[PDB]
């Protein structure tokens, strides 16, 4: 389709430069500091999780038709008795692991759905707590450069 080649090249440029800037430490915007601190905290959460247990989502049997119900049950229980930044990192790590299992077991259709379920839960049920506890700036203060 008209213009698709040009647009894709622009996205490669943007993606390459953002990768290199964040790779060397430079956070050039606000959500850039949040993303970088979230990626780092997710890697640390996964490292601590694997040292104590088996890897995430092993023993979780996901299929496309049942995945939503499992996601909904895990996330509701994770935040049942409260929210804190550590549990929010767990929420992200869980979704990441769900997507990895999905691609690994050849259910790639689930990836963009899991992203929608996470964003919905994030906006509906975590953003009010986030706003009342300093916003994403506070998260960056607590987990950035880690």
């Amino acid at each position: 389709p008209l213009g698709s080649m040009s647009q894709s090249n622009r996205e490669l440029v943007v993606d390459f430069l953002s990768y290199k800037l964040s790779q060397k430490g430079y956070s050039w915007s606000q959500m850039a500091a949040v993303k970088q601190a979230l990626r780092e905290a997710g890697d640390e959460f996964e490292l601590r999780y694997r040292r104590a247990f088996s890897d995430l989502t092993s023993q979780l049997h996901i299929t496309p038709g049942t995945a939503y119900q499992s996601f909904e049950q895990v996330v509701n229980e994770l935040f049942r008795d409260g929210v804190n930044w550590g549990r929010i990192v767990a929420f992200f790590s869980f979704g990441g692991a769900l997507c990895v299992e999905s691609v690994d077991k050849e259910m790639q259709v689930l990836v963009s759905r899991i992203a929608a379920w996470m964003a919905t839960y994030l906006n509906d049920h975590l953003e009010p707590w986030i706003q009342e506890n300093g916003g994403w700036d506070t998260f960056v203060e607590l987990y950035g450069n880690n």
Binding site: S70, Q73, L78, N84, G86, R87, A90, S93, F94
Partner: peptide, 21 residues
């Protein structure tokens, strides 16, 4: 089995939350 998973996530999240302060 999904019961056990969210408990592992919650306790690991809380350990993280503590050590971040």
């Amino acid at each position: 089995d999904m019961e056990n998973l969210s408990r592992r996530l919650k306790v690991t999240g809380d350990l993280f939350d503590i050590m971040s302060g």
